[PDB]
Amino acid sequence: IVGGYTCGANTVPYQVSLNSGYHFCGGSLINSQWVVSAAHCYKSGIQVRLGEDNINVVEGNEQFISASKSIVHPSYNSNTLNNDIMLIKLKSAASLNSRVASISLPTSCASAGTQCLISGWGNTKSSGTSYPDVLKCLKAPILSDSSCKSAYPGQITSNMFCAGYLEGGKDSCQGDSGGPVVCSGKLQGIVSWGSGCAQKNKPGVYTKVCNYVSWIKQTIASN
Numbered sequence: 596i597v598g599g600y601t602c603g604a605n606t607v608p609y610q611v612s613l614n615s616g617y618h619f620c621g622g623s624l625i626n627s628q629w630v631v632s633a634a635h636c637y638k639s640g641i642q643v644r645l646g647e648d649n650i651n652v653v654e655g656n657e658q659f660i661s662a663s664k665s666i667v668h669p670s671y672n673s674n675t676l677n678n679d680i681m682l683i684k685l686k687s688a689a690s691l692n693s694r695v696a697s698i699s700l701p702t703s704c705a706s707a708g709t710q711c712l713i714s715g716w717g718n719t720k721s722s723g724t725s726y727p728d729v730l731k732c733l734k735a736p737i738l739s740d741s742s743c744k745s746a747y748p749g750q751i752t753s754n755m756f757c758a759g760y761l762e763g764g765k766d767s768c769q770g771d772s773g774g775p776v777v778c779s780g781k782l783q784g785i786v787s788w789g790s791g792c793a794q795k796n797k798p799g800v801y802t803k804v805c806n807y808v809s810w811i812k813q814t815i816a817s818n
């Protein structure tokens with residue numbers, strides 16, 4: 596996250612870190628045994644880390660649970676990034692508490708102008724690289740479809756939305772992918788892609804979770 600703030604320990608209780616020897620992506624806990632992330636975060640050997648603040652220090656609220664299965668969306672296209680969503684099942688259910696909690700799926704799609712919370716452990720620099728150890732947060736509005744398409748001609752599908760600031764300076768970045776965009780207490784987006792980070796006229800692009808609620812519910816119900 597570039598241009599954000601320190602969230603505070605466990606103030607984003609649905610945020611997970613995906614670890615394969617190291618943090619590589621975020622995710623969102625949506626019930627005691629399932630996480631939503633980005634399809635482009637797929638790999639084998641995932642351990643889900645819940646209750647994290649500093650990802651390099653055991654602070655006492657973590658739960659580390661290996662994945663039993665991952666399910667990439669059937670229509671994910673890694674070239675276009677359309678349908679950039681996957682589900683990860685935990686081998687055992689997380690113990691839910693105030694610091695490890697699921698986030699509700701949306702009942703409706705959020706509109707341009709809605710203010711949301713984006714979070715992650717990604718790079719905090721638009722030029723160069725610095726990672727944080729603690730979770731970072733950014734408040735940002737959803738942008739209109741027309742301004743998103745104007746920013747990225749020929750690239751924005753009906754399964755994507757932009758959020759952030761056309762002036763630049765505040766954005767998601769490398770290592771935030773797969774993490775949450777939460778608006779009014781519902782998971783509306785997944786950190787997906789952009790052109791660099793925090794550049795002028797290049798806001799972050801996010802998977803539009805409301806389009807996937809049926810797929811998520813039906814997949815969970817049979818897996």
Ligand SMILES: C[C@H](NC(=O)CCC(=O)c1cccs1)c1cccnc1
Pocket residue numbers: 602606607710711712732734735
């Ligand atoms: C205490 C604060 N609560 C809110 O911001 C609620 C309201 C909220 O999410 C948003 C308002 C505008 C965009 S998003 C908080 C908690 C955790 C992390 N950072 C801040």
Ligand SMILES: C[C@H](NC(=O)CCC(=O)c1cccs1)c1cccnc1
Pocket residue numbers: 635676766767768769771772786787788789790791792799800
């Ligand atoms: C630049 C960064 N990531 C991407 O644009 C997608 C990266 C991508 O598809 C892949 C990486 C490895 C295999 S596939 C980003 C993230 C969030 C906001 N702004 C920029």
Ligand SMILES: [Ca+2]
Pocket residue numbers: 647648649650651652653654657
């Ligand atoms: Ca930790």
